[PDB]
Design a protein around this ligand. Structure first.
Ligand SMILES: [Zn+2]
Ligand SMILES: [Zn+2]
Ligand SMILES: [Zn+2]
Ligand SMILES: [Zn+2]
Ligand SMILES: [Zn+2]
Lengths: 112, 74, 303
C-alpha cells in the first residue's frame, strides 16, 4: 500500500529506498526481475562479457566516449536511432547546445 | 570539394587524423566534434566511430533501427 | 622569446628525472633517496602532491608515463637489475610486476607507441635490449618476453619511432657510452621484419665515433622523413629518408658547439619543430628551424 501511494505522487527515490531496505523477501525482490541489459560489440557482432571494456575477438575497446574520447567504465548513455553514446554527463551537456550526434553521422538524435 | 579519388590517398587521411589527435591533446573536445560533423558532411568515405549496441534477450538481434515498448523482432 | 619562472614545489633531495603525461596535468619526479612523487595541477594553476613512496633497493634513474587509454601506469628502472610497473587505485599506487631477467644495471625504460598495444622495452649495461608485452590489457600482472637484441657494446639510451602510418615498420635506436679508445660506431638502428618476425640491424651511423649520452626521435606529423637528435660532446641533428630491411639516405643538417661542455639530455615538443638541450654549464638552450631551413638558436635560459 505504501509503495503504491508513493508511486502515485511520483517519488521514485523513496519508493526504491523502501524496496531496498524492506524486511520481506517478496518486496525486496521487486527491482531484481528483468533489469539486466545485454550489450554487444558492433564491429564483430558478438556478445560482451559481464565485466570488462575490451572485446574478446576484435581486441578493441568498445565503450569509447563519443565526446571526450576516453574509456567509459561506469554510466553509459545511448541513442536507439544511430547507436551512439558516451558518458552520462557529457552527452547531456552536448545535447543542450547542439542538435547533432557528436560522433558525426548526420542524425538529429532528439528529432528536434 | 576534392574528388573521391584524391580523398582516398593515404596521405590526406594521415593529416586529418594527426590534426584530430592534436585537438584531443589540448582538451578541445567540442571543436573536434564540430570538425567531425563538417568532415562527415563533405567526405562520405570514412565511417564514424564504432561502439556497443543493445540486443534482445529472446532473439539475440539488435533493438536498434508495433508497441514502442516491445522488441521490433519478436 | 622564452621567459623563465620558479615553481613552488618542495623537494628534500636532488632530482634525477622529470616526466609528464599525455595532457600535461600530472608529473612524476624521482629523487636521491629513492622516492617518487606524483604532482597534480589545479584550476588556479598551483601544483599539489598526491603520493610518495620508496621503491627500489638501489638508486633510481628513470620514470615514465603511459597513454591514458590503458589507465594510469608508471614504469621505473633502477640500479638493482629490475624495472617495475605501478598502477593507481582510488589514492595509493600499488605494484604489479617486477622484471628480473637482467644481470646488470638497467639504464633506460620506454613505453611503446599506442597502435602496437601495451609494450615496453628496457636496456641494460651488458649489451642486451629486451622487449615485453601484455596480451590482456585488464591484467597488468601478466607480462611476456618476446625479443632479445645483442648490441656488442654498453647500452645507455633508447628511443622509439613515433610514426603510426601504415607504411612505416616499427623502429628502435640504441646508443652507447663506452669510452674504449677505438673507432666503432656508437649509434645503430633496428627495424622489424614482418616476414621472419624478428628484429634486424638496418643502419649504423658511422660518423658518430664518440661517447653518446642521449638520443631522441621527433614526432612525424605527416612528413616524408624522420628526424633524429644526438647528445655527444656536441649537438647534432640527422635525417633519414626511405628509398630485406629498407634502405635510407642519411644526411646531416645541424652541428652545434655552443655549450663547450658535454650535453646530457635532448627532448622535442609535440609538433617536432623546437629542441631543448642541457649541458654541463648550467644553461638550457632552444633551437628552431628558419625560412632558409637553417637551424638557428632561439633562446638561452640559465638555471
Ligand atoms: Zn568485437
Ligand atoms: Zn567522456
Ligand atoms: Zn550517431
Ligand atoms: Zn542518434
Ligand atoms: Zn526480440
Amino acid at each position: 500500500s505504501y509503495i503504491d501511494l508513493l508511486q502515485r505522487f511520483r517519488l521514485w527515490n523513496v519508493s526504491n529506498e523502501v524496496v531496498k531496505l524492506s524486511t520481506s523477501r517478496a518486496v525486496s525482490c521487486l527491482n531484481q526481475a528483468s533489469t539486466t541489459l545485454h550489450v554487444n560489440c558492433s564491429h564483430c557482432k558478438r556478445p560482451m562479457s559481464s565485466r570488462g571494456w575490451v572485446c574478446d575477438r576484435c581486441h578493441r575497446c568498445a565503450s569509447m566516449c563519443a565526446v571526450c574520447h576516453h574509456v567509459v567504465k561506469g554510466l553509459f548513455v545511448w541513442c536507439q536511432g544511430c547507436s551512439h553514446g558516451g558518458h552520462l554527463q557529457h552527452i547531456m551537456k552536448w545535447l543542450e547546445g547542439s542538435s547533432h550526434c557528436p560522433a558525426g553521422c548526420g542524425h538529429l538524435c532528439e528529432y528536434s | 570539394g576534392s574528388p573521391l579519388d584524391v580523398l582516398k590517398d593515404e596521405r590526406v587521411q594521415y593529416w586529418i587524423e594527426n590534426y584530430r589527435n592534436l585537438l584531443d591533446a589540448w582538451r578541445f573536445w567540442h571543436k573536434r566534434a564540430e570538425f567531425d560533423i563538417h568532415r562527415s558532411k563533405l567526405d562520405p568515405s570514412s565511417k564514424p566511430l564504432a561502439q556497443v549496441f543493445v540486443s534482445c534477450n529472446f532473439c539475440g538481434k539488435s533493438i536498434s533501427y508495433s508497441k514502442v515498448t516491445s522488441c521490433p523482432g519478436c | 622569446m622564452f621567459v623563465a619562472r620558479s615553481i613552488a614545489a618542495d623537494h628534500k633531495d636532488l632530482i634525477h628525472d622529470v616526466s609528464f603525461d599525455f595532457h600535461g596535468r600530472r608529473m612524476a619526479t624521482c629523487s636521491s633517496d629513492q622516492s617518487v612523487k606524483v604532482w597534480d595541477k589545479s584550476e588556479s594553476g598551483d601544483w599539489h602532491c598526491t603520493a610518495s613512496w620508496k621503491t627500489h633497493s638501489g638508486s633510481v634513474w628513470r620514470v615514465t608515463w603511459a597513454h591514458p587509454e590503458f589507465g594510469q601506469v608508471l614504469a621505473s628502472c633502477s640500479f638493482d637489475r629490475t624495472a617495475a610497473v605501478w598502477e593507481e587505485i582510488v589514492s595509493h599506487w600499488v605494484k604489479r610486476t617486477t622484471l628480473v631477467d637482467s644481470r646488470t644495471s638497467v639504464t633506460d625504460v620506454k613505453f611503446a607507441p599506442k597502435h602496437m598495444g601495451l609494450m615496453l622495452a628496457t636496456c641494460s649495461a651488458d649489451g642486451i635490449v629486451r622487449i615485453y608485452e601484455a596480451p590482456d590489457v585488464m591484467n597488468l600482472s601478466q607480462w611476456s618476453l618476446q625479443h632479445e637484441i645483442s648490441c656488442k657494446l654498453s647500452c645507455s639510451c633508447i628511443s622509439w619511432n613515433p610514426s603510426s602510418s601504415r607504411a612505416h615498420s616499427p623502429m628502435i635506436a640504441v646508443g652507447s657510452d663506452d669510452s674504449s679508445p677505438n673507432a666503432m660506431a656508437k649509434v645503430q638502428i633496428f627495424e622489424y621484419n614482418e616476414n621472419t618476425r624478428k628484429y634486424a640491424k638496418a643502419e649504423t651511423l658511422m660518423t658518430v665515433t664518440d661517447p653518446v649520452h642521449d638520443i631522441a626521435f621527433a614526432p612525424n606529423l605527416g612528413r616524408s622523413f624522420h628526424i633524429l637528435a644526438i647528445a655527444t660532446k656536441d649537438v647534432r641533428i640527422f635525417t633519414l629518408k626511405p628509398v630485406g630491411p629498407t634502405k635510407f639516405e642519411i644526411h646531416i643538417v645541424a652541428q652545434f658547439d655552443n655549450h663547450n661542455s658535454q650535453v646530457w639530455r635532448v627532448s622535442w615538443n609535440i609538433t617536432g619543430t623546437v629542441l631543448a638541450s642541457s649541458g654541463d654549464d648550467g644553461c638550457v638552450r632552444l633551437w628552431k628551424a628558419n625560412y632558409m631551413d637553417n637551424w638557428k638558436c632561439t633562446g638561452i635560459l640559465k638555471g
